[PDB]
RNA sequence: CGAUAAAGAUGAGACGCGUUUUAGAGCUAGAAAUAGCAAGUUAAAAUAAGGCUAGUCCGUUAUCAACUUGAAAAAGUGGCACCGAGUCGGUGCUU
DNA sequence: ACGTTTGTACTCCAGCGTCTCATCTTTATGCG
DNA sequence: GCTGGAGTACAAACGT
């Protein structure tokens, strides 16, 4: 039979609601066959339901932890590099110093050499920690020593600098001597003249505000160049020097960039060295502004100013510490034990030994400082956030690597005379500090990664010193862009040409001009310009004028070439749109119309623009054009190198001039140039009986021939969770087609709360798959897209109200009403929703009458009867059995919580490495269970060695999962299970459904906790009343309708008692939370004499006691009911396990009572 | 109709902090128990266990009823009406 | 008839800030 | 924040 039906969907980020209706808008009911060892053999089910699943996560967290893993690996490799550089000498001075460093984490019994990590004795360790209290004291000492020092001290200082090196944001060497901001500004004005500045520059005001403030209070007269260089200093960026200093072109000589030197040279040619002193002062002032807050110390007594500043911070911590100690011992003696001994408060002891930040300690110690006297400067430092500070602090992220490199340079230039190996390896260690893999090279994989693009020039290990001789950086950055840009849509095998290609612009000119038509003198035939005439017009106007030519210019060229027949032109605009811009720039730079005109040099120019579009670091551009420097002078070689092109086109070169029909041999560009008086455009050759259009379809089919369902949802443009929803929606559609005897649905209706267009296309592609004799796709299944507004409109107009707090039936009810509205309006119209209200209002206040049976105007149709349609959809909405399935999913993600908890005697701690005993070291805690397994075996119970046979539910950790799947039997025997039964092991993922007495259901949250599994089928009257009462002040309708709703909600005030009675009955049947229910009834009893709106707004809040899923806390009326957790899955082992299909219609029920 | 801007997705390269264990000798009184006093700012190592394909890679995204085949991918498996409704029941027909 | 284990109820806890660069869609806004 | 793990105190129920 035909068995006509339709399928409705509601795709969500967290759920997929589905419904099947017939031609009479009825849900069909069908009896299904179940499997398993249970006694039930057939179950009657209704063809409406929803599928719930966890939200799809983005890849960002995985990306960040992957990047962190790479960073830790690289830092460990730097430590190994420096431990191979110092290796031979360190074997002589103190062998196993590196080994004492590596075993520092272990407890003293687990150590192999000595507990003291540096010198191996107690006296020298104490002397080191007293002579150099922090690492910065040793850093300052080794920077300024002039004496020989122990090699361990040099290693510790330089290793601390390499391990914590700083940011690479400031490009260019930063001299630490420039520190006076006021002198920098006055020197800028003075050098300009020859050719509170400190407070204003170092103020925390914005760079825009800072420049504006200095410009407002500007003593310099006729000194706009001083103001521009001041912008280039404080802001770090000058404006266009064509107006700032009368340069030839717009020159933005912004500092802190590698292009600063090249733009400065361009300005020196463009201005004529009339701003060099300004640029020089700007650089000095930019430095002194940048290092101002970083190095808050005078810079005339040391070469390591960061060490001096941190020593000053340590010293002020000590001074204000002893003074605060004295003042609390002298004025508030009842608080010294709390501030300086208690590690649980936010005092000093919590700030150092506990877990208090600087903010928390400041907030705690401020009121103590206020009430006591003598605390003036301590308070002043606290507002300046400079009281009792530490060196390793949150604000150390602004220290540039130039400072650490300067200190490291100072030790390798102060200790190189005594230790000779430092002198030849100085640049090696400096490279180890400063080497940073570029963003266009990526992971240095040998081919064993799915994220790598790097190409190797050699086959050797990539050390930080052979990176430029082993990694082909050109091909690396080429592959970096070439994996990211999309392939050709027509030919999905090969890549895509740059947007600024000469071939593409020539194609656009010739395609527009081929679409353009001329007009003859007598016949006035459109046709087109001839191919020779086309090239002549291009060279006359489009190759002459950089901007597009006007129709007047085209007419002037037509009359200029030969005597015009008629300058009128058909199929053309007032001005053209295609421009020969890149050829014009090459004619303005290369300045010869020979290489840019000869077709033998076309591939050269295409590679030129490939380089300009591809690379943006300008050294890469430098080398790739240096390959081609033999055909041009050096000046244009360093001028065109500074040209950057942005953008990628949507067409490829094989589509444009690579595909040629075997009958003709002409390219698509050649066909556009000369079509034999046919004037066919690109879309003409792409959609005709020519051989070009056939090969495109054959390649679009042959290549990407798989194009799997998960692939095509995966390669879309949207959030991952909505892609999960779309994929589950498609699977639901397939199974719903299967359920009805594999007959196709007549319509499919879609609603999501461009991606809608795409999911419509997927469903249309899978359902509509039949072509006629003339190869025309017959639309057997009309996939319909619907906005969400219409559904809510009817929901409110026909009072088909939803409270989402009752149950998850509202999802499938949205799906059913979706497939009611959509297929009604596809019939009534083949206000638009005014065909619905029978008493439709008018501008005169008249309730214009409507027919009971609505119909289409043009032809007779049963679109909507205002009787027996209410009854059907009311029945389906009040229908108690609708199939909600929570998607059983194996958990993936982190093994446990990321917090490293301290040591305990508990066994729940997890070994953070292989041999780290957690009772000594501590470690991770609370692991994540991948899935639970039901194991029937016998355990060792009792002191008398008794094998008590037991059935238990054991949770498998994500970490344990691979070891369990390698050998389940051996894993169980290692766990403590003797003589297990291999064939009764059942894999139970999260949200596995179990059925118990009185229809009670529980979902498996884990091996030791369950979730509520039942749904309260509260009738339509109660949910309609609850929406009317809670939206009492937000009715948003006509005043008569609002008054009628108010009268209706006042007349049924007794419905609250019926609602709470339904809640109590359903909670007593399946929820089984006696104390929570008693507190609920006490709270409802206490709060009866309150208005109905608030009462129903909190009866809505009540319904999360009975909601599907995890137990949750809630508040009714100023009282919080804490969650009743089911923390024992012992009842589940005697229950009935239900396996369900994605729709849930097809079931497999296992009686676990019979297993064992 | 080019063009700009915002948001989102994906990928790469870098810092700063935090946590853990250990190292920085606590002293004095007291038989001890516990007090009085001193002091504190730093470093090493690890930062998903680990894996083989041994890379200055990979390891937390996406995918996932049961059943029968398939290496996997993937394919295959469950009769239809009608009257009723508290998580679906009943009746008839036919396999 | 002690003893040990499983059921309850209750409380607490959960890795986080920044910067540079690149490539795609998808919305949006004034032009006119 | 969610919601699952874990610790703690206290008693009921099952083992021997």
Author numbering: 1 to 195, 207 to 764, 926 to 1002, 1041 to 1366
Publication text:
Following DNA cleavage, Cas9 remains stably associated with the dsDNA, limiting product release, and results in single-turnover cleavage kinetics.
These states represent the progression of Cas9 through its reaction cycle and comprise the (I) pre-activation, (II) pre-cleavage, (III) checkpoint, (IV) product, and (V) dissociated states. Following R-loop completion, the DNA adopts a kinked conformation and induces large conformational changes in the nuclease domains. The pre-cleavage state represents this intermediate where we observe that the DNA is bent towards the central channel, diffuse density for both HNH and RuvC nuclease domains indicates rearrangement towards active conformations, and the DNA remains intact.
